[PDB]
Design a protein around this motif. Structure first.
Motif, PDB file in Angstrom:
ATOM      1  N   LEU A 110       0.823  -1.200   0.000  1.00  0.00           N
ATOM      2  CA  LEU A 110       0.000   0.000   0.000  1.00  0.00           C
ATOM      3  C   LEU A 110       0.860   1.254   0.000  1.00  0.00           C
ATOM      4  O   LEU A 110       0.398   2.331  -0.388  1.00  0.00           O
ATOM      5  CB  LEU A 110      -0.944  -0.012   1.195  1.00  0.00           C
ATOM      6  CG  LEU A 110      -2.161  -0.899   0.967  1.00  0.00           C
ATOM      7  CD1 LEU A 110      -3.146  -0.729   2.074  1.00  0.00           C
ATOM      8  CD2 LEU A 110      -2.813  -0.574  -0.346  1.00  0.00           C
ATOM      9  N   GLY A 111       2.113   1.138   0.436  1.00  0.00           N
ATOM     10  CA  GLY A 111       2.993   2.292   0.417  1.00  0.00           C
ATOM     11  C   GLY A 111       3.361   2.717  -0.990  1.00  0.00           C
ATOM     12  O   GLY A 111       3.663   3.885  -1.237  1.00  0.00           O
ATOM     13  N   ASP A 130     -10.110  10.178   5.647  1.00  0.00           N
ATOM     14  CA  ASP A 130     -10.401  10.939   6.851  1.00  0.00           C
ATOM     15  C   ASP A 130     -10.463  10.046   8.084  1.00  0.00           C
ATOM     16  O   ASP A 130     -10.518  10.546   9.209  1.00  0.00           O
ATOM     17  CB  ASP A 130     -11.700  11.715   6.669  1.00  0.00           C
ATOM     18  CG  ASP A 130     -11.551  12.868   5.696  1.00  0.00           C
ATOM     19  OD1 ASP A 130     -10.417  13.358   5.524  1.00  0.00           O
ATOM     20  OD2 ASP A 130     -12.561  13.295   5.103  1.00  0.00           O
ATOM     21  N   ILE A 131     -10.475   8.734   7.901  1.00  0.00           N
ATOM     22  CA  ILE A 131     -10.419   7.798   9.017  1.00  0.00           C
ATOM     23  C   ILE A 131     -10.064   6.419   8.482  1.00  0.00           C
ATOM     24  O   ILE A 131     -10.570   6.003   7.439  1.00  0.00           O
ATOM     25  CB  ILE A 131     -11.747   7.779   9.797  1.00  0.00           C
ATOM     26  CG1 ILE A 131     -11.743   6.683  10.847  1.00  0.00           C
ATOM     27  CG2 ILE A 131     -12.898   7.602   8.874  1.00  0.00           C
ATOM     28  CD1 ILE A 131     -12.953   6.680  11.690  1.00  0.00           C
ATOM     29  N   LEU A 132      -9.189   5.712   9.189  1.00  0.00           N
ATOM     30  CA  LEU A 132      -8.736   4.393   8.777  1.00  0.00           C
ATOM     31  C   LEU A 132      -8.954   3.410   9.913  1.00  0.00           C
ATOM     32  O   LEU A 132      -8.560   3.681  11.046  1.00  0.00           O
ATOM     33  CB  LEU A 132      -7.266   4.421   8.384  1.00  0.00           C
ATOM     34  CG  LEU A 132      -6.564   3.070   8.385  1.00  0.00           C
ATOM     35  CD1 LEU A 132      -7.024   2.257   7.222  1.00  0.00           C
ATOM     36  CD2 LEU A 132      -5.084   3.246   8.334  1.00  0.00           C
ATOM     37  N   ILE A 133      -9.570   2.272   9.607  1.00  0.00           N
ATOM     38  CA  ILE A 133      -9.834   1.208  10.568  1.00  0.00           C
ATOM     39  C   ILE A 133      -9.070  -0.019  10.110  1.00  0.00           C
ATOM     40  O   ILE A 133      -8.911  -0.229   8.907  1.00  0.00           O
ATOM     41  CB  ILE A 133     -11.331   0.886  10.659  1.00  0.00           C
ATOM     42  CG1 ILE A 133     -12.163   2.155  10.686  1.00  0.00           C
ATOM     43  CG2 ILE A 133     -11.606   0.125  11.910  1.00  0.00           C
ATOM     44  CD1 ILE A 133     -12.030   2.920  11.936  1.00  0.00           C
ATOM     45  N   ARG A 148       4.021  -3.235   8.942  1.00  0.00           N
ATOM     46  CA  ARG A 148       4.939  -2.255   8.374  1.00  0.00           C
ATOM     47  C   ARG A 148       4.367  -1.630   7.115  1.00  0.00           C
ATOM     48  O   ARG A 148       4.581  -0.445   6.855  1.00  0.00           O
ATOM     49  CB  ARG A 148       6.284  -2.900   8.073  1.00  0.00           C
ATOM     50  CG  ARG A 148       7.228  -2.949   9.234  1.00  0.00           C
ATOM     51  CD  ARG A 148       8.518  -3.623   8.816  1.00  0.00           C
ATOM     52  NE  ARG A 148       8.394  -5.077   8.743  1.00  0.00           N
ATOM     53  CZ  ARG A 148       8.618  -5.891   9.767  1.00  0.00           C
ATOM     54  NH1 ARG A 148       8.977  -5.393  10.937  1.00  0.00           N
ATOM     55  NH2 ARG A 148       8.486  -7.198   9.622  1.00  0.00           N
ATOM     56  N   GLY A 149       3.646  -2.412   6.312  1.00  0.00           N
ATOM     57  CA  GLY A 149       3.012  -1.843   5.135  1.00  0.00           C
ATOM     58  C   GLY A 149       1.933  -0.846   5.497  1.00  0.00           C
ATOM     59  O   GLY A 149       1.836   0.235   4.900  1.00  0.00           O
ATOM     60  N   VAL A 154       0.368   4.945   6.331  1.00  0.00           N
ATOM     61  CA  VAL A 154      -0.035   5.973   7.285  1.00  0.00           C
ATOM     62  C   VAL A 154       0.977   7.108   7.307  1.00  0.00           C
ATOM     63  O   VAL A 154       0.636   8.261   7.579  1.00  0.00           O
ATOM     64  CB  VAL A 154      -0.219   5.359   8.681  1.00  0.00           C
ATOM     65  CG1 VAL A 154      -0.415   6.436   9.715  1.00  0.00           C
ATOM     66  CG2 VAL A 154      -1.391   4.421   8.686  1.00  0.00           C
ATOM     67  N   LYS A 155       2.240   6.797   7.036  1.00  0.00           N
ATOM     68  CA  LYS A 155       3.240   7.855   6.951  1.00  0.00           C
ATOM     69  C   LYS A 155       3.105   8.633   5.653  1.00  0.00           C
ATOM     70  O   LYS A 155       3.282   9.854   5.633  1.00  0.00           O
ATOM     71  CB  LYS A 155       4.642   7.270   7.068  1.00  0.00           C
ATOM     72  CG  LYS A 155       5.749   8.231   6.681  1.00  0.00           C
ATOM     73  CD  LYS A 155       7.027   7.489   6.308  1.00  0.00           C
ATOM     74  CE  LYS A 155       7.964   7.355   7.499  1.00  0.00           C
ATOM     75  NZ  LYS A 155       9.289   6.766   7.176  1.00  0.00           N
TER      76      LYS A 155
END
Ligand SMILES: [Zn+2]
Ligand SMILES: [Zn+2]
Ligand SMILES: [Zn+2]
Ligand SMILES: [Zn+2]
Ligand SMILES: [Zn+2]
Length: 1830
Positions: A110-111, A130-133, A148-149, A154-155
């Motif tokens: 996903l990065g 706007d929000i991640l679950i 880590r992915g 998220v970074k």
DNA sequence: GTCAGCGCATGG
DNA sequence: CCATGCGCTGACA
């Protein structure tokens, strides 16, 4: 007060069991949430998910949206941006239920800037969210690569909020550290699911993180949104007869019956079970399941026994210990609702401290609903996670896959609370769009264009008939007739469900309770066969829905009437009413009945039919009993009312009843009567009388104060006479206890018949407990009903005793009886019924004329229905002024449930039921909208499947945008509700068309459609058997060979016909159907695309015949001069040669076959071995008239290399050893290449078969073809195509599609859901991931598969012929010689059988053992199976002959009773060996203990084991075994205490803790050894007693007299005697079946032997010695001798054996006779010389093996014992092989076969079972049976 | 490669 | 001092 609130059910709270209501309450509690919708300005909240599994965040958010809209009238839209899931079945579950815009495969990438979707699209990642679950895989630590992915993503994109959910014991501090490294503040709490509305106790950990005190506020607020549970788990379960639960149960039965039971080792947990039974003073009885060692279990009637037969002994004994644990508290499971998760150990088992809770349902769970008697199905496991299952959409997922989804999900209430708190806290960090007006314009235009489009789908209505109008009809035959049919159609066994019927019903004599024969043995009523005539429930469904009105209404009820009823009941002598109860009751009743329009909902077949009518504030139900049917009115308490409020308690039971006039022709005619709420209490007198019995606890086995507790057999109840006047039905009398008739605590009593109360129904007195109350709450009851009741249903009751009273031995007591709810009648109340039209297509196919091409965008109408509704209390389902879709994939089930009253009245719509449509369509057409083309598969290299990214993108996109085939629309115009239904036919047609493969046959595709009404499901079904038509009653034709054989001619005719094809432009018509079904109405509409194909071939398969090759070369030499095709393709060279492809060892026999019959009739160019194609040349290879090939040629890699050179592919390309899907795709590309090459271009050195077209191809076996050359033989091309075979592969659809593929016919296409699971796995081994996803996304029905099998069966009728051995053209008969094993001989079989039972052994284990002493002891224990493995294999030989070992030449018994002495001595020696092993290990343990004590200070296993074992008074098993054990331990030097001085054995092989672990393991070994010793001594006692009784002297009297009971042939009974097989005791048969019914031996003190009724062996069964003669041989062998001596002298015999150990014994046996025999074995090759020696009268009665020609010279065949195989297929194969050996052909004499079998033995069993299964599963046919005379 | 026996930890 | 945790490894097909 919040931690004690979740202890038990909160009574002061209301009950709440609906998820949407939960979220309404939640959104209510926090009003600050509106501020979030204010912060965003029309913007859509963007949400991302990672590994959530059941997408529970999305459900939570959607329900919060509905709640906030209803509460504040605002709009908060959310936008599911993307999701992530990695298991294909979970992916498909998502994609069906939620349709996310993007569904990525793996999170690790996903990065990156691009990632693969579940289709293979390779879209780029979305971006800002706007929000991640996330959860369940995103904390991967405990490598953790996925975390880590996620962190990389998220970074890269900074989301304001991140929420994680995972298991409690995970590295959360590392997570907080990592987030801190990436600049995120984080915090985590533990939240209990039972703390947010739901009665499930499950604790998790959530984590909140945001870019940098917010997490602390988030924690506090989440903990503030806590609301305990208030409904029991049973509000979330489905009903046990509901179709999905019953489908599960039937799948269990089907899986078991379609198909051993080897014992697992569980000694370490058995020790804990034993210590539990001993520590809690439970008994050693198994009350729930009567499970046994080396055997089966059989539960109570209602308990899903096919589930209990599938679990292991640990699980089953846990169920036992749990029921025993509850019974110690006064609770009887089975009649109280609780769940148990038995997947763990017995010591860490708190099923639930409070019964209403469900324990954590983990991913690996063994759940058990106490009431249901079975497991928690996957759907119910989901529904306990806050997921609304009414519209779940699941397709073909195992119970463990569903258990996995459910176990790893997150509860929607907890995620809702966490996300509510997150959004409310961080509400500012979410940006705002602040451009709302434009957005509003867009969204309004969107809904506008959508509303237009939905208003125009359904095109038609012109051919609608609009002919009729119908409602409120009552086709009324007669009420007694209806009651009679009802009584015979209802449910008789629990296993029947809503729609099934079972054979052999039994009905109990008192308390008539019905059950089948298979069920219904554990609780043993006094049964008798049922005298009922089974009528279908569907038939009665029709007639019963005919009688009923579809709407009803109660009128004539008002205040003054109720006031009159009350004042009259008070004028009569009844209960007075409290003013407040009357106030509430009257108010509620009236506000419920007023403006009530009850509508029909459903019927239910439940041992008593019931019709359910539902209104807005009350339910009305017509219970249709055998005696006194009636309507029942139930008023619903307001939803905003506590659990312990008074009103809710008043409205629990029906308040009005209506008993019908049985003579009346009317269904709603009789008078009404009301149940005034008056509570009255009266005194009463109970008294016990008669003989006294053991109580319930004592009969369970409990051993505390519950040992030897007694209860009376009859109670006598005496009331004050005035109370009998007050009460409606008289209760005084005596009620006899019925102990064998099951009820709560076996408390069922039955009123003894009295005067003037004969016409009334029978009245019972028993204990009726509440489902979730406590034990002190329960109380005995007086009722006429005794059935099991669903949840929410109550049983009619006359009175209720105190809660104190329980059965006992007390003489007589005075208790308070509670009569309440007096039934009084009012004549005012009345029940009444209530231009609605409907339109159907006039004539079928007028529609099909009305449709066009390119009509896919429209849905032709099928129905329209107008009905007068009313404006007030009309639901939201009917949109006002404009049509509204239903969107059935998400709301169809709940919509069609409210349209039941309308639909059930509708006529079937069967006008259009036959295939009728347009035809002659274009060969090349893909709608590309209804059927997009699947992408092409690419191969990487070790070979990996690829997907075209552009093709996959287009396929996924177009696949989303497909028209649904059915359309349902509703609208409301001026208080008239009209709704229409449309069927998009052209869509179905285009799909079925697209599936069919492209070809060049100059035949056109026709199209068809039809709609099948009122269909039902077909789920659990046995496999089809494909039967083959034979070559018979077909003409014969003459033909330059020397002979013509008659039956060979009749098949030559058929071959010629199939070849020539006179007329007959088409031979077959390939069919391809694409179905759609609307389930709730029971409509299945399917569209068909078919085209005919002409193929001039045939398949012949003769197991046994005079010949297969002569007829083939006859065909060839016949058709030798004819031009086969009119069309010739220019690419391929033609030859007149005929090619044969044979597995290779017969390539030598074929040309010598053709040599004899036709001598030099033509040229033969037989080749063998790859280096034969190199020497040939096309012109020389041409001008031949036959070719012989070897199938191995296609294994030679030089062949493929030369084909490559000629096809001009890359030289290394097309190279593979395995030859699978990769190889086939590759070879097909090369095939196109080679044709395109040979198009251009004289003699040439090296030809290859694939380059030229043959006239005729023949395959000699087709089943030897090993899948590397199967491709090569399929691609081979010619004009005619035949198959030759010994046995055709016709087991299933794939096997036959293979034959069709060879023929050239697209018989079908594979869906990968048709075969068994075993074939499915091998198919899967090469599937891409996208394919494993697409297989779960879509499925097909059972009727689809059935139609495909019917098509294949037709293919078999047209092409495949099996010429089989002829009846009455070869006379054959079967004889059966069954005998009885004499006394001393049968005794040894009995001993071996029971000895192998006791020592729980069935098979030798091939796996070696690492520990050396372990393998040594294992062999010492396996010595029992001396001859071989598989205890059945040993038993069969013991049927064949009496001996201990058949491979040992040391001891031979010259007679029976000498082998008995051998066996006694051997078992004595083995007992000694085992005692010596015990003593050795005890010394080793003494060493360990001393070595620890010398270094340790010093719970302890070994000390406790010694203390307990040294006590002779406590022992499970014999007392003699305990004697032996104590003698060993005294010889070991123990005087009830460990001794410092050892026996001098090696001390401590051998830091302290580790050796203590070693001592513990040694203790476990010791327990195992003592158990084995007990088994040994028991078996020895049994055998010695058997022999003693069998001798029949005064020695027999000594024992037969000494019985444990006290009934002996000595005083003066001549009755009967029987002994047990588990132990050796003998009492008296009658006085033994009683104790065996209670799982106990006759002497309960000395032996604890776990008795079953199958262990009883009658003394007379054993026999008496000196009765028959078996001087020196087995009975089987002697009877074989008699048999051969019986038949004539000139006839030659043949014998078949299975075990070689018996070869010597039978040869010796027959040499004792005068018969000379011949044995083939002993020579690797002179065996054929033996068959030459068999062909001078040199030999007779030749013997040979069961598994190793034409031994026609003999006609008789003799089978010793039955063939023993693991599979039925192999059994039938070998049996027909052997029988065909004598039954080939060229037989002058009639064949006889003889099967010697031993009565009451294992061979009888195998024979019976195999014979039974051969009739169903195979359609194999029997041989006549005649009693043989010589 | 898969599955059931087998085990005390842990937070409050 | 209680209520609650939810997998792993080793035997086997
Ligand atoms: Zn049954
Ligand atoms: Zn009964
Ligand atoms: Zn189409
Ligand atoms: Zn007796
Ligand atoms: Zn016994």
């Amino acid at each position: 007060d919040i931690k004690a609130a979740v202890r038990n059910m909160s009574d002061d709270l209301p009950p709440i069991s609906d998820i949407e209501a939960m979220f309404d309450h939640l959104v209510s509690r926090i009003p600050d949430i509106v501020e979030l919708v204010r912060q965003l300005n029309g913007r859509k909240l963007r949400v991302a998910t990672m590994c959530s599994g059941t997408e529970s965040p999305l459900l939570a958010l959607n329900m919060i949206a509905k709640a906030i809209k209803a509460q504040h009238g605002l709009t908060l839209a959310f936008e599911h941006v993307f999701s992530c899931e990695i298991e294909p079945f979970k992916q498909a579950y998502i994609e069906r239920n939620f349709t996310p815009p993007i569904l990525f495969r793996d999170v690790t990438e996903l990065g990156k800037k691009r990632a693969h979707t579940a289709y293979g699209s390779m879209v780029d990642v979305p971006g800002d969210v706007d929000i991640l679950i996330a959860g369940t895989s995103c904390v991967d630590y405990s490598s953790g690569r996925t975390f880590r992915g996620m962190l990389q993503w998220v970074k890269k994109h900074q989301p304001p909020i991140v929420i994680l959910e995972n298991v409690c014991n995970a590295p959360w501090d590392k997570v907080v550290e990592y987030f801190g490294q990436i600049d995120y503040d984080a915090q985590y709490t533990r939240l209990d699911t039972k703390e947010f509305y739901i009665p499930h106790t499950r604790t998790r950990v959530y984590l909140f993180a945001t870019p940098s005190d917010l997490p602390e506020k988030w924690a506090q607020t989440v903990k503030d949104l806590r609301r305990p549970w208030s409904s029991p788990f049973e509000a979330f379960l489905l009903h046990t007869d509901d179709p999905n639960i019953h489908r599960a149960r039937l799948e269990l039965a089907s899986a078991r019956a379609q198909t051993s039971r080897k014992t697992t080792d569980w000694n370490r947990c058995e020790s804990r079970h034993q210590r539990a039974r001993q520590d809690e003073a439970l008994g050693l009885l198994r009350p729930l399941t009567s499970w046994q060692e080396a055997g089966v279990c059989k539960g109570l009637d209602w308990t899903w026994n096919d589930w209990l037969l599938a679990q292991t002994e640990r699980v089953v004994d846990l169920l036992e210990i749990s029921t025993l644990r509850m019974a110690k508290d006064g609770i009887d499971s089975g009649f109280k609702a609780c769940i148990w998760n038995v997947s763990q150990n017995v010591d860490r088992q708190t099923g639930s401290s409070k019964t209403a809770l469900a324990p954590c349902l983990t991913p690996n769970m063994i759940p058990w609903v106490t009431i249901r008697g079975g497991p928690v199905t996957g759907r119910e496991a989901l529904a306990l996670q806050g997921i609304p299952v009414r519209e779940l959409l699941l397709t073909s997922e195992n119970e463990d896959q569903l258990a996995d989804l459910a176990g790893n999900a997150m509860t929607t209430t907890v995620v809702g609370s966490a996300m509510i708190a997150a959004l409310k806290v961080a509400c500012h960090k979410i940006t705002e769009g602040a451009n709302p007006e434009k957005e509003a314009a867009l969204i309004l235009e969107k809904e506008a264009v959508d509303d237009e489009q939905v208003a125009n789908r359904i095109i038609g209505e012109d051919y609608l008939e609009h002919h009729d109008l119908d409602l409120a009809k009552v086709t009324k035959s007669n009420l007694s007739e209806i009651l009679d049919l009802a009584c015979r159609s209802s449910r008789h066994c629990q296993c029947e469900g809503q729609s099934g019927t079972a054979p052999n019903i039994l009905e109990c004599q008192e308390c008539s309770y019905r059950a089948c024969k298979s069920c219904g043995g554990r609780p043993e009523h006094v049964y008798a066969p049922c005298a009922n005539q089974r009528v279908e429930p569907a038939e009665f469904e029709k007639r019963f829905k005919g009688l009923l009105p579809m709407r009803v209404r109660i009128a004539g009820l008002t205040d003054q009437c109720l006031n009159a009823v009350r004042k009259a009941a008070e004028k009569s002598n009844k209960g007075s009413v409290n003013d407040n109860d009357w106030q509430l009751w009257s108010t509620a009743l009236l506000e419920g009945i007023h403006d009530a329009e009850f509508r029909f909902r459903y019927l239910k077949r439940q041992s008593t039919w019931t019709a359910v009518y539902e209104a807005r504030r009350a339910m009305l139900s017509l219970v249709l009993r055998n005696q006194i049917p009636e309507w029942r009115l139930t008023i619903k308490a307001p939803a905003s009312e506590p659990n312990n409020s008074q009103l809710r308690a008043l409205l629990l039971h029906p308040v009005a009843r209506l008993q019908i006039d049985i003579a009346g022709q009317d269904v709603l005619c009789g008078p009404w009567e009301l149940c005034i709420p008056s509570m009255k209490t009266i005194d009463i007198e109970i008294t016990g009388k008669g003989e006294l019995l053991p109580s319930w606890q004592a009969s369970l086995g409990l051993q505390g104060p519950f040992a030897n507790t007694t209860r009376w057999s009859e109670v006598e109840i005496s009331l004050q006479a005035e109370d009998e006047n007050t009460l409606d039905r008289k209760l005084s009398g005596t009620y006899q206890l019925l102990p064998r008739c099951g009820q709560a605590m076996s408390s069922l009593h039955k009123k003894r018949p009295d005067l003037s109360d004969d016409g009334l129904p029978q009245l019972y007195f028993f204990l009726d407990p509440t489902r979730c109350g406590e034990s002190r709450e329960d109380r005995y009851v007086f009722s006429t009903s005794t059935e099991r009741l669903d949840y929410g249903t109550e049983r009619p009751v006359i009175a209720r005793l105190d809660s104190h009273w329980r059965e006992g031995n007390e003489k007589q007591r005075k208790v308070k009886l509670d009569v309440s709810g007096a039934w009084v009648k009012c004549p005012e109340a009345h029940l009444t019924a209530i231009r609605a039209t409907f339109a159907i297509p006039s004539s079928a196919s007028a529609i099909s004329a009305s449709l066009t091409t390119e009509g896919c965008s429209h849905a032709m109408a099928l129905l329209s229905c107008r009905v007068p509704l009313d404006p007030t209390h009309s639901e939201s389902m009917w949109r006002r002024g404009a049509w509204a879709e239903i969107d059935l994939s998400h709301q169809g089930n709940t919509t069609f449930a409210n349209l039941a009253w309308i639909t059930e009245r509708l006529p079937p719509l069967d006008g259009l039921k036959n295939w009728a449509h347009i035809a002659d369509d274009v060969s090349e057409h893909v709608c590309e909208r209804c059927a997009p083309r699947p992408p092409k598969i690419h191969w990487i290299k070790t070979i990996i499947a690829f997907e075209d990214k552009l093709e996959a993108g287009q396929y996924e996109h177009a696949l989303k945008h497909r028209p649904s085939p059915f359309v349902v629309q509703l609208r409301l115009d001026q208080d008239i509700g009209s709704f229409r239904i449309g069927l998009n036919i052209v869509s179905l047609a285009h799909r079925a068309l697209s599936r069919l493969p492209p070809t060049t046959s100059e035949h056109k595709i026709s199209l068809s459609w039809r709609l099948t009404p009122g269909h039902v499901t077909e789920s659990p079904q046995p496999r089809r058997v494909f039967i083959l038509p034979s070559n018979k009653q077909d003409p014969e034709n003459s033909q330059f060979k020397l002979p013509l054989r008659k039956e060979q001619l009749r098949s030559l005719w058929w071959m010629l016909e199939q070849e020539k094809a006179t007329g007959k432009t088409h031979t077959f018509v390939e069919e391809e159907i694409s179905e759609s079904l609307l389930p709730a109405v029971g409509w299945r509409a399917e569209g068909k695309a078919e085209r005919p194909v002409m193929v001039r071939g045939g398949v012949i398969a003769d197991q046994v015949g005079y010949g297969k090759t002569v007829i083939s070369i006859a065909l060839v030499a016949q058709t030798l001069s004819l031009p086969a095709p009119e069309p010739a393709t220019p690419g391929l060279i033609d030859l007149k040669a005929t090619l044969i492809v044979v597995p290779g060892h017969l390539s030598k026999q074929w040309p010598n076959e053709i040599a004899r019959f036709t001598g030099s009739m033509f040229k033969v160019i037989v080749i063998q071995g790859m280096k034969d194609l190199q020497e040939k040349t096309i012109a020389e290879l041409g001008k031949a008239d036959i070719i012989v090939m070897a199938s191995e040629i296609f294994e030679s890699d030089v062949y493929w290399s030369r084909l490559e050179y000629l096809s001009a592919q890359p030289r290394e390309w097309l190279h593979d050893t395995q030859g699978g899907r990769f190889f086939c795709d590759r070879l097909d590309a090369a095939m196109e290449s080679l044709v395109s090459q040979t198009k251009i271009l004289k003699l040439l050195p090296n030809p290859v078969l694939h380059m030229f077209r043959f006239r005729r191809v023949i395959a000699d076996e087709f089943t030897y073809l090993q899948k590397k050359s199967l491709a090569a033989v399929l691609r081979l091309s010619s004009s005619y195509r035949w198959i030759l075979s010994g046995t055709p592969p016709v087991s299933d659809f794939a096997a036959i599609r293979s034959i069709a593929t060879f023929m050239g016919i697209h018989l079908g296409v594979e869906d990968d859901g048709e075969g068994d699971v075993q074939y499915q796995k091998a198919r899967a081994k090469d599937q891409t991931q996208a394919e494993k996803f697409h297989a779960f996304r879509e499925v097909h029905s059972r009727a689809w598969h059935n139609r495909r099998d019917e098509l294949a069966q037709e293919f078999l009728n047209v092409f495949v012929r099996q010429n089989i051995a002829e009846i009455e053209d070869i006379p054959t008969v079967e004889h059966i010689h069954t005998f009885k094993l004499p006394a001393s001989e049968g005794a040894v079989y009995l001993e071996l059988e029971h000895h192998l039972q006791a020592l729980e052994m069935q098979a030798r284990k091939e796996t070696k053992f690492k520990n050396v002493s372990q393998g040594d002891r294992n062999a010492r224990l396996e010595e029992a199976l001396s001859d071989s493995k598989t205890a059945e294999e040993a038993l069969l030989k013991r049927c064949c002959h009496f001996t201990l070992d058949l491979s040992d030449k040391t001891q031979d018994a010259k007679s029976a009773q000498e082998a008995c002495d051998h066996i006694t001595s051997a078992r004595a020696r083995q007992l000694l060996a085992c005692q010596e092993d015990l003593s050795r290990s005890v010394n080793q343990a003494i060493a360990l203990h001393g070595w620890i004590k010398k270094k340790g200070g010093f719970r302890q296993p070994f000390a406790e084991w010694i203390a307990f074992s040294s006590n002779i008074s406590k022992h499970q098993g014999d007392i003699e075994a305990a004697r032996i054990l104590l003698k060993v331990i005294e010889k070991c030097g123990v005087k009830d205490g460990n001794i410092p001085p050892s026996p001098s054995d090696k001390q401590s092989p051998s830091k302290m803790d580790d050796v203590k672990w070693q001592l513990r393991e040694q203790t476990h070994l010791l327990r195992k050894l003592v158990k084995e010793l007990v088994a040994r001594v028991r078996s020895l006692r049994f055998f010695e007693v058997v022999r003693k009784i069998q001798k029949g002297k005064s020695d027999a009297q000594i024992v037969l007299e000494s019985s444990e009971c006290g009934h002996k042939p000595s005083t003066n009974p001549d009755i009967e005697m029987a002994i047990l097989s588990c132990c050796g005791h003998v009492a008296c048969h009658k006085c033994m079946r009683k104790a065996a019914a209670s799982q106990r031996c006759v002497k309960s003190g000395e032996c604890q032997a776990a008795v079953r009724p199958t262990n009883i062996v009658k003394v007379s069964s054993l026999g008496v010695e000196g009765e028959l003669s078996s001087g020196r041989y087995g009975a089987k062998l002697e009877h074989l001798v008699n048999l051969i001596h019986s038949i004539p002298k000139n006839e030659r015999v043949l014998v078949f054996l299975q075990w070689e150990d018996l070869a010597g014994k039978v040869s010796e046996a027959l040499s004792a006779g005068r018969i000379p025999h011949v044995t083939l074995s002993g020579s690797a090759k002179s065996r054929a010389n033996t068959l030459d020696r068999f062909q001078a009268d040199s030999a007779r009665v030749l013997l040979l093996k069961m598994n190793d020609s034409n031994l026609t010279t003999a006609n008789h065949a003799v089978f010793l014992g039955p063939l023993f195989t693991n599979s039925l297929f192999n059994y039938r194969a070998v049996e027909t092989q052997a029988i065909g050996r004598v039954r080939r052909y060229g037989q002058q004499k009639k064949v006889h076969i003889h099967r010697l079998l031993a009565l009451d033995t294992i061979d009888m069993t195998i024979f019976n079972a195999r014979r039974t299964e051969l009739k169903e599963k195979t359609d194999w046919e029997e041989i006549p049976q005649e009693e043989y005379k010589g």
